[PDB]
Amino acid sequence: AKHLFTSESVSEGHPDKIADQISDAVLDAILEQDPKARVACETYVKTGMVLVGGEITTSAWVDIEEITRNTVREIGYVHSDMGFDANSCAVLSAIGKQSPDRADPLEQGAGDQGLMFGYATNETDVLMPAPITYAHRLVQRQAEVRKNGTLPWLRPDAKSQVTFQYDDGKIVGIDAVVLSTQHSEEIDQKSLQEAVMEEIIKPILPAEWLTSATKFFINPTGRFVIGGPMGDCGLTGRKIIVDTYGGMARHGGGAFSGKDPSKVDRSAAYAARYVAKNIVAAGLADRCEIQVSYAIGVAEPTSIMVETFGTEKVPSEQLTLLVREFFDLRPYGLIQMLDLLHPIYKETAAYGHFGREHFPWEKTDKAQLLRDAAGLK
Amino acid sequence: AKHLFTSESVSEGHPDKIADQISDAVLDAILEQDPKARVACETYVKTGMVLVGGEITTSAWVDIEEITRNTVREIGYVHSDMGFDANSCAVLSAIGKQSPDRADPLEQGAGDQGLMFGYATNETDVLMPAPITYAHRLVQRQAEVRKNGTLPWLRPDAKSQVTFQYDDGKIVGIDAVVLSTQHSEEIDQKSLQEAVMEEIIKPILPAEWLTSATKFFINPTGRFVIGGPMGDCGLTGRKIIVDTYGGMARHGGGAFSGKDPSKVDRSAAYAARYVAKNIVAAGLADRCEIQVSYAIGVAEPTSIMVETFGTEKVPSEQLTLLVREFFDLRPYGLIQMLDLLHPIYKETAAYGHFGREHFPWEKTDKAQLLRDAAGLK
Ligand SMILES: [Co+2]
Ligand SMILES: [Co+2]
Ligand SMILES: [Co+2]
Ligand SMILES: [Co+2]
Ligand SMILES: [K+]
Ligand SMILES: [K+]
Ligand SMILES: [K+]
Known part of the structure; x- marks a missing residue:
């Protein structure tokens, strides 16, 4: 029996993921020095601003600022006209340290x-x-082609959502595809649509699944030019479903990033x-x-x-x-x-x-x- | 066929819920004056601190500080020895206002x-x-008896988790119950256990469901005395499953609080x-x-x-x-x-x-x- 199901993903550099990555960057950084550290480190990012706040219990001495900024730079937010600059945004932190008793x-x-x-x-x-697999693969592709100069007009922030039609248990094919990438003021929208079709969509999605019928929506609202933290709010633990299985399987409350494994x-x-x-x-x-x-x-x-x-x-x-x-x-x-x-x-x-x-x-x-x-x- | 399933709830005044309630308190406050306001208002609360940050687009003029503090006081965190005081914590805000174009x-x-x-x-x-219904009912009861002087040794923060055994589709009864309430330094633990048994558990759970076998765990780790924001971090959108259906049914990414209905x-x-x-x-x-x-x-x-x-x-x-x-x-x-x-x-x-x-x-x-x-x- 027919029925359809949808799942969403977002790139590195969607604001909640910027938060997720920063938290985890601090988790790794302590785990490098002290694998048994207890850490819970919730980040919040907003237009000027990264607040990384935590309770940490460790030996380790680690530089939250430097860690934060580097992560923001890897994602690529590096100039005010993107909406956020890694080298000049403010990083506040509020980490209570407990030395191991x-x-x-x-x-x-x-x-x-x-x-x-x-x-x-x-x-x-x-x-x-499949939906969560393909959604992740669209957004990955978009960070990939951005980062490797193929499509260098495109900026970090991006969402994908793929909706699959199944007959009984069996993926029949793809009813709709939506992709919305932040891009420079340079490129405009029809030319962008060809590009994402060529370079992000057609090389990721299985062709047998795409038809005459697949409703594709690429930057539906047009001009996505400032993104990331600018005008928005990332917090760790918000893209909790995307993390998992896109809504196919169930979820307990809980977020992963910034928690060490005792959690x-x-x-x-x-x-x-x-x-x-x-x-x-x-x-x-x-x-x-x-x-x-x-x-x-x-x-x-x-x-x-x-x-x-x-x-x-x-x-x-x-x-x-x-x-x-x-x-x-x-x-x-x-x-x-x-x-x-x-x-x-x-x-x-x-x-x-x-x-x-x-x-x-x-x-x-x-x-x-x-x-x-x-x-x- | 037997199988068991569990769901969790937390009271008002668990830190993520303090955040949820504050956000929504600002949503209501604007909606009172301007029912068509667009609001997205993510809160973060931490030991000294409530940061309420948003993008809001409205006529309305509203006092974020006053709103915040009142909400913290309703929940009842009102003195340093609880862990957090509504009348003296710091409320920072970062709300970008757009006047309607x-x-x-x-x-x-x-x-x-x-x-x-x-x-x-x-x-x-x-x-x-049933599990999510009963979990919510335990935590409600605990705020109820706290607030109405019956059990006034008990402080805001609290979690409940109920695990139900079902044979085919049909609730058979309750395998385990866990409840953990923040309480004053005054009462101690065996006396508390009788009280929560009398006054929170026995009057909420269906008796036919409880047996000789129901594993009850009441403050398992003992002395829960400082709670709320003290030593922890609330953010809006973290108790996302509890909000819903405790993990029985599925979830898309998304949080509710602090978003107006256009969302x-x-x-x-x-x-x-x-x-x-x-x-x-x-x-x-x-x-x-x-x-x-x-x-x-x-x-x-x-x-x-x-x-x-x-x-x-x-x-x-x-x-x-x-x-x-x-x-x-x-x-x-x-x-x-x-x-x-x-x-x-x-x-x-x-x-x-x-x-x-x-x-x-x-x-x-x-x-x-x-x-x-x-x-x-
Ligand atoms: Co978000
Ligand atoms: Co939890
Ligand atoms: Co939490
Ligand atoms: Co969303
Ligand atoms: K976390
Ligand atoms: K969440
Ligand atoms: K929200």
């Missing part, structure tokens, strides 16, 4: 409560929903991506969504639900069974199973935390063991 | 792109998932709650989730999906059909259908935007017409 460390309990969700589906090479909100979610992906690369089901939860000071998850939406090749009790045998879902266990105490996190902060294959949670190393304990098959 | 206004296009989701299910009197992220989501609830009070299905999307400058939604998860009493094409006949889903249509240009919004900012019955989107006024166009039945 059971038998089996794996038994330490959850830092805070929470529910968190993970998905995979075999609809993609990366085991991700279940990040880790437990990475681990759930990891269990669900392994469940599917193993041929245990076609789609798998999984809810974990935790309660403060208990170590075991208060809840595990698995939902393979009628797509299992083994009954489900047996599934949740081996969910538990192959995975240490306790707070310190996650951190062990995925080897998290490293400065890996800024790369996460833009184009999808998931679907991207060199992160510890994307590897399908438990594939076979899951298969051949799922009976033997 | 097609044939059928209903045809004006979407302000921005987005996907948004709505749900109902007949699992509750209010047509909401699809709010409105379209309220309208989706409205269509889905009417679909179920009409007996068209048991659970209905609905995805709407929009693209910038188009007026019609780019996408409508309805998902009545095998629970329809009419086939689905016919459903999406009458989804379209009974509802004006265009940006200005939503605003018409739900009569939004009023100062109604601060009440939204704490305990659930939905499930709460005197908001324009909760009324089931299209009930019958939907029934008797759904064939006649």
Whole structure:
């Protein structure tokens, strides 16, 4: 049966992502010097202004200003006529520093409560929903061609949204595509439309999916010239769905960036991506969504639900069974199973935390063991 | 089949909610004077500090400081030993003001792109998932008994999380309950546990659902004495799931508070709650989730999906059909259908935007017409 579904993505340099990247840049920077630092670092950015505020608990000494400005420059906001300059905006910070003050460390309990969700589906090479995969790929492409002089009239800020029509479970093709890139005053709009069609859209989207019918909307309102923080507000934790799975699978409250791995909100979610992906690369089901939860000071998850939406090749009790045998879902266990105490996190902060294959949670190393304990098959 | 599911809520005065309430307090305050003001007003609160920053476009003159402080006082943070004082914290603001500069206004296009989701299910009197209903009810109760001198040793900040076990679709009962209230240095912990059991938990949760087996965790880590902004960070748009449906139904990126109704992220989501609830009070299905999307400058939604998860009493094409006949889903249509240009919004900012019955989107006024166009039945 037909039905359509949509998902959105935004580039590096959309204001909430500028915030996400800065936070994580500070997370990495401390993790480089002190892999066991506790950090929670929420950023806010606004037209003149980056306020990076935190509670951090570490040895490390790190230069918030310098870190901030460098990140703003990588994204490329470097002159007042863009809307924001990395070399002259104000960076205020408000980071409270705490200097660091059971038998089996794996038994330490959850830092805070929470529910968190993970998905995979075999609809993609990366085991991700197609819409969120393609939306991310449009916006990536736009930062790519910007950065590499191909299309150098184009400025950082940009959104993509792709809407896919499916008949039963099966992607039929692409009903609409929308892309809106900040660009210089130099280029004008029909010429831009050809360019993004040539260079961002046609080389990313599968042709078989595009038809005579695909409604494309490229800068629909025209002249997107000042963007980024100018006239807008980024805060960490706002593009929370884009981070995940574009609205295909569910979400607990929680944001990732600027939280170190002791934070279940990040880790437990990475681990759930990891269990669900392994469940599917193993041929245990076609789609798998999984809810974990935790309660403060208990170590075991208060809840595990698995939902393979009628797509299992083994009954489900047996599934949740081996969910538990192959995975240490306790707070310190996650951190062990995925080897998290490293400065890996800024790369996460833009184009999808998931679907991207060199992160510890994307590897399908438990594939076979899951298969051949799922009976033997 | 058994499986469990969890949802979380937080009180007024959890820091992200303090932010949510302040933003919305400014939204209402302008809407009182200028119902057509465009406002987007993101707040950030941190130990000394409320930064309320915005882009606003209105006639209205309003006192951000005074508004902020009053809201902080209603929640009750009123003395340094709580962690935050409404009468002496600093309120900085950064609001850019713009003074206001097609044939059928209903045809004006979407302000921005987005996907948004709505749900109902007949699992509750209010047509909401039970977990998110009960979690909100625990935290409400805790603000209630605090505020009305029953339990006056208790301070604002608090979280609840309830985990429900279901056999097929049918709530069986409550596996675990967690509640963690900030409290004065006066009361200690065993005495507090009796009190919250007597006065917050036993009078809110259905008894038939509680058993011999219900794992209750009340202040698990003990002594929650300073809370609110002290040592933490609120930002608007962080308790985004709690706002919705606790993780039962899906989410687009988007936050509500501090956005006026021209903002699809709010409105379209309220309208989706409205269509889905009417679909179920009409007996068209048991659970209905609905995805709407929009693209910038188009007026019609780019996408409508309805998902009545095998629970329809009419086939689905016919459903999406009458989804379209009974509802004006265009940006200005939503605003018409739900009569939004009023100062109604601060009440939204704490305990659930939905499930709460005197908001324009909760009324089931299209009930019958939907029934008797759904064939006649
Ligand atoms: Co935003
Ligand atoms: Co949280
Ligand atoms: Co928070
Ligand atoms: Co948005
Ligand atoms: K964070
Ligand atoms: K959020
Ligand atoms: K907002």
